[PDB]
Each structure stands twice: as C-alpha cells, then as structure tokens.
C-alpha cells in the first residue's frame, strides 16, 4: 500500500456549495480521488464520525507523522472572539489557525475562504474575513462561487505532484484564472459590434446578443467558464444570463448592482 497524502478540509462560514462543486469532478471522479490519490481525513459533509469522534479524527490528522495539506471552505467570522461561527465548541478562527500552522500548503476553495465572500458583504455583521487576512499567511486561492471542480482538483493534483502553481496578484493559479471570461465568450463579436440586449424579453436577447448592457461582468472577471463549461454542458452567458464576476475578490460589493454597469 502506497501512502496517500493527507488532506484536512475545514468548513467555516460557508454554504457548502464548494464541497458540492468539488464532488462534480470527473477527472478523476471523487471516489477515485479519495480511494487512490489523497487520504481525505476530515470533511464534515461526508465523514462517518460525528461529535467527539469527529473531533478526534481531526486531531489525529493534524498530528499525522507524514503531515497534511489543508483545504478551507468558508470565510472566518471574527466578531465577538470568533464565537458566531463555532465547531465542537471552538471558534472557527481558532481551529483554522491551528490547522494552518503545520499545514504543508493551504488551499482556499471558493471566494469565501479566499476573500471573505458573501458574509463579508456590507455591512458584514459577523466581521467575516478571508483566510489569508485572518491568519496572516499566503494561500492558494481557487475562487468562484463556487469554483469549477476542474480548477480545484487541478490545483490539488498540481500541489501534490508538481509544487505550487504560478499565482496571479490575488493568489489564483494562472492555469485556470489567467484569462478574462470575456476574452473567451462566444458573444464577443456582438460586444465588438455594439449589439447589446436592452432586456431579457427583447428579440436581441433571443438572438444571443451581448449581455453587457444588462450588467455582465465578464470584461473584468478572471475565470475559464466559457472554455471549460460547468457540468460538461453549460455556463451562465450560454444560459442567457450576465456574469456576476463571482471569482473576483469582494464581488458582492464591487460587482453590484448585478444588472447594471453603474
């Protein structure tokens, strides 16, 4: 039996869409990944143990002789000593700090762990922060709401087999986030010709005209959505809807109103 690299996966202030996105992987499928490639040693969504048994599983993993990689899903709520987000009676900030200290590498799956995400949007009542801000350490950011499993599983396999991939200025792998959504959008010729839909009921919309006038953030958003698709079938603009800019830091505040460019 060859040793499989230990992965510890924590959930803080999150919707679990990132976990769900990860398990949509098909190269490889998630069962092959955790049976053959990694040892997924803590993961609250799918793990058999609960309560004190689950907490002990975490602590065994954190004390593993071969070390572990850390995946973090969710931002960190810091108000009130961190008490508005707790697991096993511990503030999430405290447990993430502890897991991060001896981690071989830290991957932040999702805009929330990367940048602070939805709970961080104004007026941020929980004083939520991104992992790198909260811990004061560099992270590998796989953002998006949620990221494509191609991007997440790609990063994981890259980290275990090749090292840290080249990161952009916001901590994102250039392999996946090096290009604007817009630059690969099939509606580009419409954008260039100033052929914009004025509304979703318009004939322009029916004809697949550019969605810029309806608030599309593709021109300012770094992601590989039109190139890789989601679920092997589709992406928002193909479904006739503007991009929300969901892989950009703080998009909840920088990209809103979503249906406008104002």
């Amino acid at each position: 039996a060859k040793h499989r690299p230990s992965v510890v996966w924590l959930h803080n202030a999150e919707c679990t869409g990132c976990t769900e996105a990860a398990i949509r992987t098909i190269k490889p499928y998630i069962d092959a990944l955790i049976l053959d490639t990694i040892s997924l040693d803590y993961q609250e969504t799918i793990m058999a143990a609960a309560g004190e048994a689950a907490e002990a599983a975490l602590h065994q993993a954190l004390e593993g002789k071969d070390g572990y990689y850390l995946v973090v899903e969710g931002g960190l709520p810091t108000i009130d000593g961190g008490q508005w987000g707790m697991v096993a009676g511990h503030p999430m900030i405290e447990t993430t700090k502890k897991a991060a200290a001896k981690a071989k590498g830290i991957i932040c799956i999702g805009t929330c762990s990367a940048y602070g995400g939805v709970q961080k949007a104004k007026p941020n009542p929980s004083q939520a922060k991104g992992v790198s801000e909260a811990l004061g350490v560099k992270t590998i950011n796989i953002p998006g709401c949620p990221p494509n499993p191609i991007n997440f599983v790609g990063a994981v396999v890259h980290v275990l087999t090749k090292g840290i991939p080249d990161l952009d200025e916001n901590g994102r792998p250039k392999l996946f986030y090096g290009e604007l959504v817009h630059d690969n959008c099939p509606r580009l010729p419409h954008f260039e010709a100033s052929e914009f839909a004025p509304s979703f009921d318009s004939e322009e919309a029916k004809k697949g005209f550019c969605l810029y006038e309806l608030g599309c953030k593709g021109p300012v958003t770094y992601n590989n959505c039109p190139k890789v698709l989601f679920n092997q079938v589709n992406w928002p603009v193909q479904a006739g809807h503007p991009c929300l800019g969901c892989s950009e830091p703080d998009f909840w505040d920088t990209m809103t109103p979503f249906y406008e460019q104002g």
Partner: protein, 544 residues
C-alpha cells in the same frame, strides 16, 4: 428488541457531520432513552442584514448562497418573491423551466442525502468485507431489479476496492466511524452492507449526471444563473437537443432511483422496522411545489401538483389551507435581541445578540418559526402526508406500495423511518413525472419561445415567494421602499424543523422527535444521528 443502554446523563454531539452546516445537539438521557433535547445552530452569516438597502434584482444572487446543497431553491424563492412584489406574471415557459430545475434539484439532492449523508447511520461499511459476493448477488436479486451492477463480479470488485482501502490503514472519511468493531444498533447482514456500499460508490458518479441535467436548464450547478425578474434568461433551454440531452440524463438518474435508491431504502426499512416507532412528530406544513399556475402566491398554493396544506395532531382527515398571515418567528431562545418575538416575516427583525455556549435561555442562531403558536414539520414527510390525505393519485399509489412492502400501517410513517421513506417516495414520483413535464416544455417552447415578461419597479411594494424545496416549505418576504430593499426575510425549511424552542418554550420538530430516542451505546450515539439526519438538516439554510 431495540438495543438500549441504562445510560443516564448528558450527551452532546458537535459537530453533527453528514448535514450541511454547523449543528450542535445536546440531550439529556435517562435509562438509555433521550428525555430532553436542544437543537443548537452554531453559525450566523446574516444575509437579511446584508440585503438591506440593495437593489431588489440582486436579492436572488445573495440569497442563493444561503445554501449550496439546496442550490437554486433560494434564487427561485427570491425570484418568485420579487415577481410578486412587482406584480409580474411570468410566461408559461418560465414556470415550466423554473419547475423542471426544481425537479432536477430534488433528484440530485435526495440521492446524495440518502447515500452520502444518511446511509452510514444504517450501513456498516467495514462489515461489507465479511460478505460473500455470490451470496450477496443472490440476495440482491431478491430485494431489487436485475442489473449488472449487482452481479457477483461487480460486488466483488467493490469489496476488493474496499478491502485494499481498509488494509492501507488510512480510513479517510471512515476514521472513528460509530460502526467500527460492530455496534448493537447496526442490524444489516454483511451482504446488505456490501450491496449498499456498491451503490454508495455508484451514487457518487450518478449525482454528477443529475447535476449535469440540472445545468442544461440552470446554466451551471452549483448555483444556477438562469432566473431573472419576469421569468428566465435561458432561451437555449427551450430548444431541441438540450431538451433531448436533459431527458436522456434524467432517465439514467431515474433508472438509478428505481434500481438502487428505492430498493436499498426498502431493504433498510425492512431491517429497521422498529424505527417506525421512533422519532415521530404531529404537525405538518407544505407550500406545495410543481404548480400549473404560478401567477401569484395564492395560485401556487392552490395549483401545486405536490399539494400545499396544514395537518395538525396527525389528523389526516383535516388538511387546512395555508394561512400565510399566520406564519411568525420567535427569538426568545435564540441569539437575537429581546423584543423580537411573534414577528410576521413582512415585519421580520434580525438583530444578532450572542450570549454563551449552551445557555438554555438562548442556544441557537435559528429563529423559531411557528404557525398560530404551533411548531410545524416541513419536508418530504409533510408533503407525503398532505398529498396522501388529499388522495393525490401518485402518492396514494407509491405510499400504498411502501406500506404493503413493509406490512405496516400508515400511522407507522409518523417516525424517523417514515421521514426517511417519504424522501424516497417523492423522488420516485418526481421521476415518473419528468418525461411528461419535459414534453410539455419542449412542445411549448417549440411553438413560442417567450421566456421573460415585461415589468416595472414600484416605488413601494411588498411580496412573497413560496417554494417547497427538497427540505420543505420555503418563503422569501420583501418590503420595497424607494425602489430598494427595505426588508428581506427568509423563513427556510430547516428553520421550521431544526430551530429552537418558540416563545412558549415549546420544542421544535427535531427536538420533539428526539424525545424517546434509545441509545444502545452512549459512546457512539448513532440513534441521535438517525433522527437528526432524517430531517435532512441544512443549518446555513436555517440561519442564513
């Protein structure tokens, strides 16, 4: 009989794993049976606070991130809510497309919940190693449809994979499982363990297809991007090839439902027939789903094919209409400021105020929704009882099939076993309706592809969006003022099911269902998990 210790004392389970979100359960046990319970949600994000002052068109994008497990459902409820606030009636194609995406969500959500979240409470995976695969192949022929996946060869390959995994000493997600070394509350023969474990793994692949189907109409999964005020944006989803692919993919998913999900559920239900006397509650609520008329909240309630209603005190002879004015939320036992009790969602208040862990006076981030003073269970069981009571023919037939297979009365469904069974029942029914629903949209979209209606932002208005999400009755409530969000309140099924006590000190449904839970082994209280998981908790949904 049902294994039960003599244990008297407290049990705390935190984290509850195999749910969405962060839940702490505290119980008092006396002589091996739970006598008191607390459902304590451990994360607050505050989406309702975040939404204030924002563009009402943005609501659906913020609220969808209430949950990535029940992805889509909040975008839908928000869209229904804003559609009502601006008084736009969506086109027929938009109703159909919105409803099919919900049907897709049900299939994916329920399959994942049964196998990947709930099953490990009933199935001992390590015991599967003890099974003879030929004996298991034989038994599979006698509990389920013939399929190559259930062959001795297929079941051996699963067993060999599992064996090599266990022998590596890296048990991954099975580390410290409650079934390790055997457990008195785990009843299944090793052969049934093997069979269900094969499907567990198969289900990990099938859910990918269920999500792909949903994404054809939804744009992507998780977090769809196809709904707009006035209907939908996805003209491509009315066309021929995408609809053929959607049907083809849905038929694979449903074949798996009928070949694996339902037969595994029934096998588990047969062995754990004692769980028909554990974990029952009394009141049920549903807003209905799959309506033929979604022009208003009233038309939704009245035309949902999975009907709306209110049952009280288990009385199947009196399904009441839903009074949306009678819904309110209490905060007395929650971490919110004093003064917030008895608020209708149009007047909702979300004013966070933490005290301390395990403060019996304030112990959850969920509010306590109540209906005329009563707690209401929501979800598949609530829908199933309401449809059954009303003689909905698909439910009457499938429920009767289940009661016949198990040789149990309909009263046996008021339990954790029934709750678990209802989830499968309605998945089978969604499946049997997929083709008819797909054909209706294909034909409609061929003739005329109108997908979004015209509308105007009012200066001041209010509206409500209703859905029955996979976990139950969901409502979003907006007040618009100065064309901005003045108030936006979510009342979410897991708030109904898993919230704390209301202002009268009255246990919520999960708390009530937990009373009388037997504990075979206080070190490894799987019975708590069984009942809690059957409600399919979503704590990010419940709290938002």
């Amino acid at each position: 009989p049902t294994p039960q210790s003599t244990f008297t004392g407290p049990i705390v389970v935190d984290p509850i794993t195999r749910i969405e979100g962060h839940l702490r359960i505290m119980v008092e046990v006396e002589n091996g049976k739970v006598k008191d319970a607390w459902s304590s949600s451990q994360l607050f994000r505050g989406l309702e606070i975040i939404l204030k002052g924002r563009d009402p068109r943005d609501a659906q994008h913020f609220t969808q991130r209430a949950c990535g497990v029940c992805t889509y459902v909040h975008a839908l409820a928000s869209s229904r809510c804003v559609d009502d606030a601006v008084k736009v009636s969506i086109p027929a194609n938009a109703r159909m497309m919105r409803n099919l995406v919900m049907a897709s969500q049900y299939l994916h959500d329920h399959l994942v919940h049964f196998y990947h979240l709930h099953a490990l409470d009933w199935v001992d995976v390590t015991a599967a190693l003890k099974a003879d695969p030929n004996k298991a192949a034989k038994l599979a022929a006698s509990i389920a449809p013939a399929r190559p996946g259930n062959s001795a060869k297929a079941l051996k390959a699963v067993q060999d994979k599992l064996k090599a995994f266990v022998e590596s000493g890296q048990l991954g997600i099975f580390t410290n499982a409650y079934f390790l070394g055997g457990h008195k509350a785990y009843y299944l023969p090793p052969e049934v363990d093997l069979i269900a474990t094969a499907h567990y793994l198969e289900a990990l692949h099938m859910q990918v297809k269920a999500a792909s189907a949903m994404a054809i109409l939804g744009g992507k999964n998780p977090h769809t991007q196809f709904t707009v005020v006035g209907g939908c944006s996805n003209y491509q989803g009315l066309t021929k090839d995408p609809l053929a692919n959607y049907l083809a993919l849905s038929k694979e998913v449903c074949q798996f439902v009928n070949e694996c999900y339902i037969p595994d559920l029934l096998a588990v239900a047969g062995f754990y027939k004692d769980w028909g006397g554990i974990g029952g509650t009394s009141n049920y609520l549903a807003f209905g789903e799959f309506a033929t008329d979604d022009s208003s909240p009233e038309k939704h309630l009245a035309t949902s094919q999975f009907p709306s209603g209110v049952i009280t005190g288990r009385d199947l002879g009196k399904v009441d209409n839903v009074d949306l004015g009678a819904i309110y939320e209490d905060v007395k036992y929650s971490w919110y400021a004093p003064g917030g009790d008895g608020k209708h969602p149009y007047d909702g208040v979300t004013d966070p105020k933490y005290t301390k862990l395990d403060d019996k006076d304030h112990y959850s981030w969920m509010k306590a929704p109540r209906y005329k003073g009563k707690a209401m269970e929501v979800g598949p069981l609530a829908r199933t009882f309401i449809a059954y009571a009303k003689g909905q023919p698909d439910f009457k037939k499938v429920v009767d099939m289940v009661l016949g297979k198990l040789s149990v009365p309909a009263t046996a469904l008021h339990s954790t076993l029934g709750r678990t069974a209802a989830r499968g029942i309605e998945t089978a029914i969604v499946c049997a309706n997929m083709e008819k629903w797909i054909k209706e949209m294909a034909d409609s979209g061929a003739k005329d592809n109108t997908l979004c209606a015209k509308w105007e932002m009012p200066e001041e208005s209010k509206g409500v969006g209703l859905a029955d999400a996979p976990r139950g009755a969901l409502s979003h409530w907006i007040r618009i003022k100065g064309k901005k969000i003045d108030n936006f309140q979510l009342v979410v099924p897991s708030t109904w099911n898993l919230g704390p006590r209301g202002a009268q000190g009255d246990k919520s449904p999960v708390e009530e269902a937990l009373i009388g839970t037997p504990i075979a082994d206080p070190k490894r209280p799987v019975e708590i998990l069984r009942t809690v998981h059957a409600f399919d908790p979503c704590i990010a949904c419940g709290v938002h």
